[PDB]
């Protein structure tokens, strides 16, 4: 999306240091604990009664990796989030019945997790470039809903 070059490169460089497995595991898990109603799509993951259980759930952890995996491949197509995520958008609407407001919740969780992990390095200007990316990603994922 409307991303400044100095912005574009702030994102990219930061992402190069991200452990996608850990981070995805943590974003998704935080999502299920901070906003419990999102657990409605995960009944078959198992016990999700307590934060600990949610955070130790291998299917959560594994699903977290998949999601962020797909997100990660997206930061390489910033000039075209819509095309990259179109099939995903359809599947989310037509097979999975996921309200896109959930994509926004995850993005905000994602931004808290990046801050948790990188501390001082996650500066306000670096946070701004990520907020653009995350909203851009959410909007791409909601694009094919009818």
């Amino acid at each position: 999306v409307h991303l400044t070059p100095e912005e574009k490169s702030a994102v990219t460089a930061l992402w190069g240091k991200v452990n996608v497995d850990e981070v995805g595991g943590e974003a998704l898990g935080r999502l299920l604990v901070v906003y419990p109603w999102t657990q409605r799509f995960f009944e078959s993951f198992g016990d999700l009664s307590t934060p600990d259980a949610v955070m130790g759930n291998p299917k959560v952890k594994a699903h977290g990796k998949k999601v962020l995996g797909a997100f990660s491949d997206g930061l390489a197509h910033l000039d075209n989030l819509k095309g990259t995520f179109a099939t995903l958008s359809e599947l989310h609407c037509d097979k999975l019945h996921v309200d896109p407001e959930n994509f926004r919740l995850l993005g905000n969780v994602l931004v808290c997790v990046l801050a948790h992990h990188f501390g001082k390095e996650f500066t306000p200007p670096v946070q701004a470039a990520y907020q653009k990316v995350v909203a851009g990603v959410a909007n791409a994922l909601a694009h094919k809903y009818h």
Binding site: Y35, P36, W37, T38, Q39, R40, C93, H97, V98, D99, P100, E101, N102, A142, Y145, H146
Partner: protein
């Protein structure tokens, strides 16, 4: 927080709906589904075609609950307790969706009450629907 005046305006406007509640509930639902298609993700098991019977049936159920809240406007958290458990623990609808339905019920009411949908009343009904939404969402976490 509803005021005496709000409570009066709401009872007066809902009194006029009367035995139209269900009808207007279905209509509200149909407006929401067309205006805000993402809300269809909550009823994947329904047939959402115009005049659909599951839509009518659900519209009546929604309108009955609103009717009950009006009948119990000074005790809404308790009158709506069961419904509130259901939404928080089973249906788990995202909170923003309540705002969408609320707008649509308001549109539906406006289209049917040309004489009673004054500014004062519109205002009161908007606060009323936000209080109902707050109650239904109060046990989410």
């Amino acid at each position: 927080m509803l005021s005496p005046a709000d409570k009066t305006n709401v009872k007066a406007a809902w009194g006029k709906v009367g035995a139209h509640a269900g009808e207007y509930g279905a209509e509200a639902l149909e407006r929401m589904f067309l205006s805000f298609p993402t809300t269809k993700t909550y009823f994947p098991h329904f047939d959402l075609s115009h005049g659909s019977a599951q839509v009518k049936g659900h519209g009546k159920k929604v309108a009955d609950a609103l009717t009950n809240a009006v009948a119990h406007v000074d005790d809404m958290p308790n009158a709506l307790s069961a419904l509130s458990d259901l939404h928080a623990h089973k249906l788990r609808v995202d909170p923003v969706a309540f705002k969408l339905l609320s707008h649509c019920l308001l549109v539906t009411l406006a289209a049917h009450l040309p004489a009673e949908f004054t500014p004062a009343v519109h205002a009161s009904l908007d606060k009323f629907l936000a209080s109902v939404s707050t109650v239904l969402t109060s046990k989410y976490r």
